[PDB]
């Protein structure tokens, strides 16, 4: 029992039960705002709908109808009544906001007779039939899936016959006619079934459609891109209708109390006089900037601006609002903390702080850590842009430099992107169904629609460039081409877009590295202030190190050493070592590498200036270094005075069934200690030296990969220590160094307390750990991961987001057991997860000392790290 | 009386009397630091030296010698005594720090006999003669002006004979010999006079040389580039010597408690074992990074690091220090708040704030507003730099992208720059004498010398790129060429330098617009927080407006309108107007301009979004718009069906003796009201429109230039109001607008109360005001301004720095009288002065409402504005 709540019965706290929209309608109601009345069917009733074989239980329906009685009475109007009908809107909303992915049905309750009593009661038939044909369309769209196309097609016919230019120029007779044409569609696509004439059937149809939709392939895919758990469900909000299409003193709009693309304080958005939401979003009649409404209706604007600032001070954050003016009276229909780009969240959280509205803690905790990846998106190269051939212009909906090949359907764009092409989605407008392809594109270019069109809002969300409403464009879906300014563009052709200026360019404009907004540096100073995790970087070179330190990296959590062996002037040393038959010949071969590698390391220690650096010993099997090309093998043979066949028999001998789990890492160091001794001499000779040259202290961190047994790490640790002590004696050095291990083999975590007896520190290599915990290679996982996503078996990609429940158990355990034998054991993480907020939060919570990610992701972890401290 | 103070007798407060160095030695002494003892001859004794015909008065000498007795006793050694001599250093220092411009003489007191007693008393003759030959050189340099060259030449001979590689490898016999060769120089350049053998003559000679030097052409020029008043004088510090050349456990160094180029926290600098200051600065023996000393002498380093952090916490700012270790004992010789680049001052003031050391007020007030011009210096274009042909590398002393033509003497570089060439000064090392040319160069490239060499420190000061110590270079002063890496560079050849990486490039590398450091945005938020002046920008286009708003411009204080008449598609309209003979023909001609100008203004109001914008009416005389080329006149005649002679007679008729003070501005609007009516119709039609399109309110600000009489402004104001009211009626607009005036004719300030009866706001055009107050055109002022600088008649350029005493009187008065007739009179400033800190402080103090400067200077005024509030 208790599946439905009146707006008055809830608040912003009951969000999990009401959903964002529901809890926000309740909250605004509580504040006494001109919020039309209604009720919310809870997220729990959604789960219940799912636990009852995808059917509305008897009790929920009783309660829906029961609340509808409550509305009828409040209003003095019978729901869908043939005489003076009560009409309602039905709007779906889950705990997490999903702008552009949810559903809205306006004017529900209308039928062949309720519309006449409606036209009679309002004395405005054009208005009654306008609403009824709007409901027929939205209901067919939302409840079934008749493509808006079939309706727009019908309305376009009628306007392009009655010799009309806008929807606004249609007769009540035309609308009356259109409504019959629209109903013919829903029927002419429903096994002959006719449009539901009963208001209750309409309401239950809309309700089950919302729940049903929660499991649409598009909602699934979307929730994973946004880390929304599927079991959250969605609530359904039912509200008494207010109409912005009753006439000239009526309208509807969508506003942001601050710019969601820049963060700049002030009202932002659009509206339309005489219209319903759909129209604004669709932009057929070009939306007016919200500021112009003060021109049209100063009075409602004054009231709206006050209510908007009251909503921002109250939620203590920028608000995304929706309102409708009905014959001169203002109503608010929604408000939610507005989605925004990274630049925007920083700028805003900083103004909110400076005005006394929120604390620095509230500001840091508020920002979506993941979005900071946007801050480093390459921006355009001024010279290049300047010489760029502007071919058109429009609304800069979402910021960013996009340059890519054009496609005309999300699927074609998503696919092209898979094949490694930068893409540009060009559409009349986008819809929920285009989501994945929108996620695959560099940028989005739309023909119609403004700042609050689907593409605009979904892109601000993704942090993806979008120029929308470029009415100059003429799309040719049939031929996959479009005409703008100077030419006709065919699929594949490059074009660039500047979502900051709204400018469109012919060709592929050059871009360079983004800089960094103050307020970025400010949030970072606030982030560093509360975070306890240190943040290190995965950097293999001097240049990546600087950029990384330049972003707050406090050192290096993973310096791979493979390139020091793979590079052109190196490869032959290891090949010669591989093809030798003597431990002495293996040594001489290896030793030739010392000058080159000691050089790489010096250069890293120079760039580091005392910061630490965890150096990873050789990770791949030997087979990776030998030539695979019969020709390349030929030449290896010629260089080492061997027969091609002899080389071939060596390459064949090094071959493995599963390279991922073969003779490599520590196991390779065990059979061939020479390799580690050599890497150790290169590391220590470089440190000592750079240290005698700068006076800046260094404490090398040597890390052994692919370890699963204490004694296994000890065999290698002993080799390295002997060489490090030797190099120290040759150079009269007191330098300290620490030899630790990677924890990336499940056994290593399970026996970490034993491993900790030898390892002076642990680094969690979570790509491997996850591969071995889950039992699969990332590279082969593609042929099924997707079926897993589609089927809901996984809601997150394990390679990108740390699997807390499983792999997370091994990381917690490793740290705990490791510290039982070595209390001050320092623990870091350097697999891909180290830069993922939730992953960085789990690490903070289980005690890691630091996380480590690629240069450009450092700000994300710094911010993630601070939130983890604050939130825990 | 009281011309000399012991270190113990003063403190950091007595700076004006002691000078920076003097007051700092006193302060460190007060803190009980290992500061060798001494006394300071005050800045007042310098003035006294000047008021006595440039002679040391009898009383000052008595007091100098008197203090020297105090030292002798403290030390138990007689000043210059033949047996156990007391030796002292003499160091000049004024109230304002002038790094690289002051004087230092070490080992003063040595003579032919005191050096033997010195060698005897220390049992180290090599050490005694080393010091004596150092004193001979420095004294000849400093007191006379024998070029270091004549000595380095002599020492190079001797080393390149005794087959030696360093100064350190010279025998006491060699030094004994060298000292005689050095003395021969001072004599062989002094009318046969021999080197002063009397310690007292040496001390008085050094003292008078310091005062004398305060009036050196190079000190003058330097003080103006740095706004140091000449009457401040300089003090002379006399200190008991500590020697870092006594041996292997002796040394000398210069450190910064934080990086003065980046601001990065931590010790920065260099030193040399067995040497005296000179050596470090000169970098013959490449200076060691200060961090390496912990390797050589951990004990003195530990003590030095503690003392350094005690000096920073105490002065509560980054410290520039100088120390000497004498046979294992550490002494500090100087400390001063360190000079630094803009990036560095921000970063630092921000860390100091975050550590609790200084308040945000103390941080803002501390930064040198003028230096922010550095923050917008174009930086290199990554692609360009990447493809750049690195030809050499060295120490990145001072940050910045420099690209220019190379020169080998400051004078050649300064001159070349006058002719508009970007320049690159390449020198073995720089000296005080190269200052102006260093000020003319894009960058500085030196052969020897490190982070604390002359070029390095003076450039950090100027905010100019410098790569120093590139020992690979081979300069050919004689042929004006240098060999580096791949080639031989000849005068004029382009080369670029990256003072951030120390890299040197062949050719002219492309640069783009700088970005902006957080901590910049942070100081700005702190600056805006305390500043009361608003800051507007001098911007004539959409693009300059954005950049300007992008930097904190709160609108526009001057939108010139000339280009709207000069541009290619405009010029003929005004030419036709000029050549018409009818007020009706003048109108029709003018009116053709309205669509083009209304267009420029719309675009400005679009970019402005409600910010204000003071629009300046047509400023130049008519003669400026007519063709001056007989050919161009020919074509004007052909276009207007006139004879070339007729056009010529019009151009001749519009000619003026002095265009600066002719028929223009308001006077032109009086005779030809048409012009202002037209500009008014373009302004108001654009505002109303952009306002009907955005709903964003606009309140046009129309400003009349070159006004000196109430009734004169009223004649024009009446014309504009009639047209503005008319345009408002044609468009049904309630738009408000304000008509004000420029105050740039002295009469206008003198009668400002009358002017204020008509003008709704005043803008101070200080280029004009200053021209008319001083009675000269800036363009012709060059043939004497310099003689004025050189002669001290002016210490500041009046066109760049507001003349407070004179022109400032007219600005104060204008505001005061203006507000007697119109209390809320809004006052701004838009001449060049609006972006000069001191100029912006005077404005704040006399009540302006806002200052207005070019886009890129806005941060300077924002910061200047905040300091003005805080400091007043
Ligand atoms: O995650 C791991 O197991 C790592 O070794 C780090 P990498 O895979 O990026 O080298
Ligand atoms: O300073 C003045 O007098 C001005 O009119 C501003 P400008 O000279 O830069 O136009
Ligand atoms: Mg691994
Ligand atoms: Mg002027």
Measured in whole angstroms, how far is the alpha carbon of residue A297 from the centre of its chain?
39
Measured in whole angstroms, how far is the alpha carbon of residue A281 from the centre of its chain?
23
Residue A380 is given by DSSP the state E
Count CB atoms within 10 A of the CB of residue B655: 14
Asked whether A765 lines ligand 1 (CB < 6 A), one says yes
CATH code (residue B471) = 3.50.30.10
- Token pair listed for A578: 């591989």
What spatial distance separates the first Cα and last Cα of chain A, rounded to whole Å? Answer: 35
CATH code (residue B50) = 3.30.1490.20
Q: Which residue has the tokens 């080992």?
A: B107
Q: Which helix (H) or strand (E) holds B769?
A: helix B766-774
A382 beta partners: none
| Chain B interface, best mutation among A689, A690, A695, A731, by max B CB count within 10 A | A695
- Token pair listed for A20: 């964002």
Question: How many Å apart are CA B397 and CA B465, to the nearest integer?
Answer: 8
Clarify whether residues B705 and B722 are in a common domain: yes
- Token pair listed for B151: 């000595």
Measured in whole angstroms, how far is the alpha carbon of residue B756 from the centre of its chain?
37
Clarify whether residues B735 and B872 are in a common domain: yes
- Cβ atoms of residues A836 and A371 within 8 Å: no
Experimental method: X-ray
Asked whether A768 lines ligand 1 (CB < 6 A), one says yes
Q: Which helix (H) or strand (E) holds A279?
A: helix A277-282
Question: How many Å apart are CA B463 and CA B457, to the nearest integer?
Answer: 10
Inter-chain residue contact A519 with B515, CB threshold 8 Å: no
Helix (H, G, I), strand (E, B) or coil at A640: coil
- Token pair listed for A8: 């008055």
Question: How many Å apart are CA B117 and CA B96, to the nearest integer?
Answer: 39
**CB environment B44-67: b (16+ within 10 A), e (fewer):** ebbebbbeeeeebeeebbebbeeb
Question: How many Å apart are CA B216 and CA B222, to the nearest integer?
Answer: 10
Helix (H, G, I), strand (E, B) or coil at B803: coil
- Cβ atoms of residues A69 and A88 within 8 Å: no
- Cβ atoms of residues B128 and B246 within 8 Å: no
CA distances from B38 to A220, A711, B61, B74, B78 (A): 81, 68, 16, 10, 14
Is A46 catalytic? The answer is no
Question: How many Å apart are CA A526 and CA A704, to the nearest integer?
Answer: 35
- Domain of residue B186, residue span: 109-197
Question: How many Å apart are CA B606 and CA B623, to the nearest integer?
Answer: 33
Which atom of ligand 2 lies at the shortest distance from residue B769's CA? 3
Clarify whether residues B435 and B456 are in a common domain: yes
At residue B826, φ and ψ (nearest 5 deg) are -80, 130
Clarify whether residues A395 and A299 are in a common domain: no
Q: If we measure between CA atoms, which residue out of A632, A545, A537 comes closest to residue A828?
A: A537
Q: If we measure between CA atoms, which residue out of B373, B383, B346, B385 comes closest to residue B514?
A: B373
Q: Which residue has the tokens 């202002």?
A: B676
Q: Which helix (H) or strand (E) holds A140?
A: helix A125-143
Q: Which residue has the tokens 């360079």?
A: A512
Q: What is the secondary structure of B471-539 as a DSSP string?
A: TT-EEETTTTEEEETTEEEETT-EEEEETTTTEEEES---EE-----TTHHHHHHHHHHH--SEEEEE-
Clarify whether residues A42 and A74 are in a common domain: yes
In A626-695 the beta strands, taken as DSSP E runs, fall at none
Question: How many Å apart are CA A833 and CA A803, to the nearest integer?
Answer: 9
At residue B331, φ and ψ (nearest 5 deg) are -130, 145
Q: Which helix (H) or strand (E) holds B218?
A: helix B217-225
Question: How many Å apart are CA A425 and CA A441, to the nearest integer?
Answer: 6
- Token pair listed for A773: 């915990």
- The alpha helices in A822-857, defined as continuous H runs, are 837-845
Q: If we measure between CA atoms, which residue out of A565, A559, A596, A566 comes closest to residue A685?
A: A596
Per CB-CB distance under 8 Å, the chain A contacts of B350 are 525
Number of H helices, E strands in chain A: 35, 33
Question: How many Å apart are CA B17 and CA B44, to the nearest integer?
Answer: 6
Q: How many CA atoms lie within 13 A of B173 on its CB side?
A: 1
- The alpha helices in B387-483, defined as continuous H runs, are 410-418, 435-440, 454-462
Helix (H, G, I), strand (E, B) or coil at B561: coil
Q: How many CA atoms lie within 13 A of A722 on its CB side?
A: 11
- Token pair listed for A295: 């021109």
- Cβ atoms of residues B665 and B707 within 8 Å: yes
Q: Which helix (H) or strand (E) holds A547?
A: helix A542-550
Question: How many Å apart are CA A89 and CA B350, to the nearest integer?
Answer: 53
∠ CA(A592), CA(A597), CA(A603), 5° rounding?
A: 150
Helix (H, G, I), strand (E, B) or coil at A276: coil
Residue B102 is given by DSSP the state S
Contacts 24+ apart (CB under 8 A), B726-729: B727/B680, B727/B681, B727/B684, B727/B685, B727/B688, B728/B684, B728/B688
CA distances from B231 to B47, B206, B220, B328, B795 (A): 7, 21, 11, 42, 10
Non-local CB neighbours of A646 within 8 Å, separated by 6+ positions: A579, A637
Number of H helices, E strands in chain B: 35, 33
Helix axes B199-213 and B43-50, enclosed angle (nearest 10):
80
In A57-98 the beta strands, taken as DSSP E runs, fall at 78-79, 85-86, 88-93
Closest protein CA for atom 9 of ligand 1: A831
Question: How many Å apart are CA A155 and CA A152, to the nearest integer?
Answer: 5
Helix (H, G, I), strand (E, B) or coil at A40: strand
- Cβ atoms of residues B234 and B214 within 8 Å: yes
Non-local CB neighbours of A317 within 8 Å, separated by 6+ positions: A337, A338, A348, A352, A358, A366
The residues lining ligand 2, judged by C-beta closer than 6 Å to any ligand atom, are: B 558, 560, 744, 765-768, 830-831
Which atom of ligand 1 lies at the shortest distance from residue A558's CA? 6
Clarify whether residues A140 and A251 are in a common domain: no
Question: Taking the CA atoms of chain A, what radius of gyration do you get in angstroms?
Answer: 32
Count CB atoms within 10 A of the CB of residue A642: 16
- Token pair listed for A753: 């307390």
Clarify whether residues A359 and A387 are in a common domain: no
∠ CA(A54), CA(A60), CA(A66), 5° rounding?
A: 150
CATH code (residue B141) = 1.20.80.30
Measured in whole angstroms, how far is the alpha carbon of residue B679 from the centre of its chain?
40
**Listing from the earlier edge strand, what are the strands of the sheet with B88-93?**
B4-6, B38-41, B235-240, B88-93, B104-108
Question: How many Å apart are CA A346 and CA A359, to the nearest integer?
Answer: 14
Helix (H, G, I), strand (E, B) or coil at B366: helix
Inter-chain residue contact A515 with B516, CB threshold 8 Å: yes
Name the minimum distance, in Å, from the CA of B742 to any CA of chain A.
32
B321 beta partners: B255, B335
Handedness of CA B308, B312, B317, B321 (dihedral sign): negative
- Token pair listed for A526: 């606030």
Question: How many Å apart are CA B502 and CA A137, to the nearest integer?
Answer: 68
In B731-796 the beta strands, taken as DSSP E runs, fall at 738-743, 761-764
Count CB atoms within 10 A of the CB of residue B368: 19
- Token pair listed for A681: 């001499």
Clarify whether residues B600 and B457 are in a common domain: no
Question: How many Å apart are CA A114 and CA A197, to the nearest integer?
Answer: 9
Clarify whether residues B674 and B629 are in a common domain: yes
In A123-209 the beta strands, taken as DSSP E runs, fall at none
Clarify whether residues A298 and A206 are in a common domain: no
Non-local CB neighbours of B85 within 8 Å, separated by 6+ positions: B77, B78, B79, B109, B110, B114, B115, B117, B118, B121, B199
Q: If we measure between CA atoms, which residue out of B206, B232, B266, B220 comes closest to residue B61?
A: B206
Question: How many Å apart are CA A812 and CA B271, to the nearest integer?
Answer: 50
Burial of A603 (0-12, 13-18, 19+ CB in 10 A): middle
Question: How many Å apart are CA B581 and CA B579, to the nearest integer?
Answer: 7
DSSP strand pairing (A534-538 vs A556-559): parallel
Question: How many Å apart are CA A665 and CA A675, to the nearest integer?
Answer: 10
Of A512, A518, A692, which is closest to B295 when you measure between CB atoms? A692
Inter-chain residue contact A382 with B295, CB threshold 8 Å: no
Question: How many Å apart are CA A307 and CA B848, to the nearest integer?
Answer: 37
Inter-chain residue contact B518 with A513, CB threshold 8 Å: no
**Listing from the earlier edge strand, what are the strands of the sheet with B494-498?**
B390-393, B503-506, B494-498, B401-407, B423-427, B443-446, B465-468, B395-398
CA distances from B674 to B539, B562, B618, B684, B740 (A): 25, 16, 12, 15, 19
Burial of A197 (0-12, 13-18, 19+ CB in 10 A): middle
Q: What is the secondary structure of A471-491 as a DSSP string?
A: TT-EEETTTTEEEETTEEEET
Inter-chain residue contact A521 with B525, CB threshold 8 Å: no
Question: How many Å apart are CA A376 and CA A384, to the nearest integer?
Answer: 19
In A83-167 the beta strands, taken as DSSP E runs, fall at 85-86, 88-93, 104-108
Residue B338 is given by DSSP the state P
CA distances from B479 to A544, B429, B476, B490, B827 (A): 43, 18, 5, 8, 57
Question: How many Å apart are CA B838 and CA B867, to the nearest integer?
Answer: 10
Which atom of ligand 2 lies at the shortest distance from residue B830's CA? 6
Measured in whole angstroms, how far is the alpha carbon of residue B138 from the centre of its chain?
29
Total structural domains within chain A? 6
CA distances from A53 to A50, A208, A220 (A): 6, 12, 19
Backbone torsion region of residue A754, taken as left when φ is above 0, otherwise alpha when ψ lies between -120 and 50, otherwise beta: alpha
Question: How many Å apart are CA B298 and CA B292, to the nearest integer?
Answer: 9
Catalytic annotation, pick one of A23, A350, A465, A830: A830
Question: How many Å apart are CA B480 and CA B483, to the nearest integer?
Answer: 11
A701 beta partners: A614, A738
Question: How many Å apart are CA B803 and CA B796, to the nearest integer?
Answer: 8
Question: How many Å apart are CA B476 and CA B434, to the nearest integer?
Answer: 18
Question: How many Å apart are CA B591 and CA A87, to the nearest integer?
Answer: 58
- Token pair listed for A405: 């090949």
Clarify whether residues B729 and B831 are in a common domain: yes
Catalytic annotation, pick one of A377, A417, A439, A454: A454
Non-local CB neighbours of B276 within 8 Å, separated by 6+ positions: B106, B107, B131, B134, B243, B244, B245, B252
Helix (H, G, I), strand (E, B) or coil at A712: helix
Q: If we measure between CA atoms, which residue out of B388, B391, B389 comes closest to residue B484?
A: B391
Question: How many Å apart are CA B690 and CA B687, to the nearest integer?
Answer: 5
Clarify whether residues B796 and B809 are in a common domain: yes
Q: What is the secondary structure of B663-697 as a DSSP string?
A: S-THHHHHH-HHHHHHHHHHHHHHHHHHHHHH---
Name the minimum distance, in Å, from the CA of B391 to any CA of chain A.
20
Closest protein CA for atom 3 of ligand 2: B765
- Cβ atoms of residues B138 and B106 within 8 Å: yes
Per-chain residues with Cβ under 5 A from ion ligand 3: A 744, 765, 768
- Cβ atoms of residues B425 and B402 within 8 Å: no
- Cβ atoms of residues B130 and B109 within 8 Å: no
**CB environment B748-776: b (16+ within 10 A), e (fewer):** bbebbbbbbebbbbbbbbbebbbbbbbeb
């Amino acid at each position: 029992a208790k599946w439905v709540y009146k707006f008055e019965e809830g608040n912003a706290s009951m969000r999990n039960l009401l959903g964002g929209k529901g809890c926000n309608l309740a909250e605004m109601t509580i504040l006494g705002m001109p919020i039309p009345q209604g009720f919310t069917v809870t997220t729990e009733a959604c789960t219940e709908y799912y636990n009852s074989g995808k059917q509305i239980t008897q009790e929920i329906q009783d309660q829906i109808f029961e609340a509808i009685t409550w509305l009828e009475e409040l209003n003095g109007k019978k729901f869908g009544d043939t005489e003076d009908p009560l009409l309602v809107s039905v709007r779906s909303g889950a705990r997490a906001s999903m702008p552009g992915m949810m559903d809205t049905i306006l004017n529900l309750g209308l039928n062949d007779v309720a519309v006449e009593g409606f036209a009679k009661k309002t004395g405005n038939p054009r208005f009654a039939y306008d609403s009824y044909r709007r409901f027929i369309q939205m209901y067919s769209d939302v409840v079934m899936e008749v493509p808006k196309s079939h309706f727009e097609k019908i309305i376009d016919a009628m306007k392009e016959e009655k010799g009309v230019h806008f929807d606004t120029d249609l007769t009540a007779d035309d609308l009356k006619e259109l409504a019959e044409k629209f109903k013919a569609v829903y029927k002419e696509a429903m096994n002959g079934e006719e449009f539901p004439q009963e208001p209750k059937d309409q309401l239950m149809g809309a309700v089950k459609a919302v729940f049903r939709s929660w499991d649409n392939p598009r909602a699934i895919v979307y929730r994973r891109m946004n880390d929304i758990p599927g079991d959250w469900g969605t609530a359904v909000n039912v509200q008494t209708m207010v109409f912005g299409n009753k006439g000239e003193t009526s309208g509807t709009g969508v506003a942001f109390t601050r710019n969601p693309s820049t963060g700049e304080k002030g009202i932002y958005g659009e509206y339309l006089i005489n219209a319903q939401g759909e129209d604004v979003v669709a932009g057929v009649r070009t939306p007016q900037p919200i500021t112009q409404l003060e021109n049209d209706m100063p009075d409602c604007y004054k009231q709206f601006m006050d209510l908007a600032m009251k909503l921002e001070k109250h939620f203590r954050d920028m608000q995304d609002m929706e309102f409708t003016i009905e014959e001169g009276k203002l109503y608010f229909l929604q408000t939610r903390n507005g989605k925004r780009t990274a630049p925007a969240a920083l700028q805003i959280a900083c103004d909110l702080v400076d005005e006394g509205m929120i604390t620095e803690e509230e500001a840091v905790v508020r920002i979506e850590a993941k979005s900071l990846d946007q801050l480093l998106h390459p921006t355009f190269n001024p010279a290049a842009l300047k010489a760029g051939e502007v071919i058109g212009s429009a609304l800069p909906a979402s910021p960013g430099a996009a340059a890519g090949k054009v496609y005309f359907t999300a699927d074609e764009a998503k696919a092209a992107h898979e094949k490694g092409e930068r893409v540009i989605l060009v559409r009349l407008e986008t819809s929920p169904e285009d989501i994945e392809g929108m996620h695959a594109a560099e940028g989005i270019l739309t023909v119609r629609g403004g700042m609050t069109s689907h593409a605009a809002v979904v892109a601000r969300g993704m942090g993806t460039c979008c120029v929308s409403g470029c009415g100059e464009i003429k799309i040719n879906e049939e031929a996959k081409t479009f005409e703008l300014g100077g030419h006709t563009f065919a699929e594949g052709d490059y074009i660039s877009l500047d979502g900051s200026t709204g400018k469109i360019y012919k060709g592929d404009i050059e871009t360079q590295e983004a800089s960094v907004s103050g307020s970025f540096e400010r949030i970072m100073v606030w982030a560093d202030k509360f975070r306890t995790l240190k943040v290190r970087t995965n950097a293999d070179t001097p240049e990546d190190t600087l950029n990384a330190v330049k972003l707050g990296a406090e050192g290096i959590g993973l310096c791979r050493t493979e390139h020091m062996f793979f590079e052109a002037d190196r490869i032959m040393k290891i090949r010669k070592m591989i093809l030798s038959d003597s431990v002495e010949a293996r040594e001489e071969a290896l030793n030739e590498l010392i000058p080159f590698q000691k050089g790489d390391f010096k250069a890293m220690y120079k760039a580091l200036e005392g910061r630490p650096m965890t150096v990873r010993y050789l990770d791949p099997p030997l087979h990776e270094f030998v030539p695979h090309t019969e020709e390349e093998q030929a030449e290896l043979a010629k260089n080492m005075g061997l027969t091609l066949a002899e080389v071939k028999a060596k390459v064949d001998e090094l071959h493995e069934f599963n390279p991922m789990m073969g003779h490599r890492g520590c196991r390779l160091a065990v059979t061939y200690p020479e390799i580690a001794k050599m890497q150790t001499r290169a590391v220590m000779e470089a440190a000592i030296e750079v240290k005698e040259e700068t006076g800046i202290d260094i404490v090398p961190e040597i890390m052994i990969p692919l370890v699963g047994e204490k004694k296994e790490l000890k065999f290698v640790k002993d080799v390295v220590v002997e060489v490090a002590e030797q190099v120290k004696k040759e150079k009269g050095s007191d330098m300290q160094y620490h030899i630790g291990t990677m924890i990336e083999i499940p056994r290593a975590a399970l026996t970490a307390d034993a491993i900790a007896e030898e390892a002076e520190f642990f680094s969690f290599g979570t790509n491997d750990l996850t591969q071995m915990t889950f039992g699969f290679s990332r590279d082969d996982a593609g042929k099924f991961l997707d079926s897993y996503y589609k089927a809901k078996i996984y809601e997150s990609d394990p390679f990108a987001r740390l699997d807390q429940t499983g792999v997370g158990q091994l990381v917690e355990m490793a740290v705990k057991k490791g510290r039982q034998t070595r209390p001050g054991l320092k623990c870091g993480i350097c697999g891909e997860h180290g830069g993922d907020p939730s992953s960085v939060e789990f690490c903070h919570k289980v005690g890691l000392n630091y996380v480590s990610c690629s240069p450009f992701r450092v700000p994300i972890a710094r911010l993630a790290a601070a939130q983890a401290a604050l939130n825990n």
